Amino acid sequence: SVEPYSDAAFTQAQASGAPVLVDVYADWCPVCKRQERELTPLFAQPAQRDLRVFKVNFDTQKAALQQFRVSQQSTLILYRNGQEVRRSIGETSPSALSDFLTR
């Protein structure tokens, strides 16, 4: 699933046991645009079937940025079982983004 970040939906996703992707975007970022392109089909693939994606708007959700220790748009943070596994900034290789979600 893909949904806008909110406190309540994020906390419920983290308590669910499912993997969670925090995707920090900006409406005027060509990298972000580019990422979104390549991530959208990856989100629909069977290996991603349990992934809960939250889109954090860099411009409007500043409390979320502090929580996630995020200083740049195009940051991706992957959680499993409620704990951060890895993060990535600015990556636009389709194979690298696939592997970021999969490994």
Numbering used by the authors: 0 to 102
From the paper:
The gene of ETAE_2186 was among the top 3 upregulated genes and was annotated as a hypothetical thioredoxin; here, we named it Trx-like protein (Trxlp). In this study, we found that one of the most significant infection-induced E. piscicida genes, trxlp, could be secreted and translocated into the cytosol of host cells upon infection, showing a conserved crystal structure to the host thioredoxin protein. Taken together, our results provide the first comprehensive, functional analysis of the E. piscicida Trx family protein Trxlp, a novel virulence effector that mimics endogenous TRX1 to target ASK1 and suppress its activation, thereby inhibiting the phosphorylation of Erk1/2- and p38-MAPKs and disrupting the expression of inflammatory cytokines and diminishing the host antibacterial defense.
Trxlp displays a similar structure to that of the canonical Trx fold, consisting of a β1-α1-β2-α2-β3-α3-β4-β5-α4 topology. This central β-sheet is sandwiched by 2 layers of helices: a bottom layer with 2 helices (α1, α3) and a top layer with the other 2 helices (α2, α4). Minor conformational differences among these structures were observed in flexible loop regions connecting α helices and β strands. Taken together, unlike the classical Trxs, Trxlp might not exhibit robust redox activity.
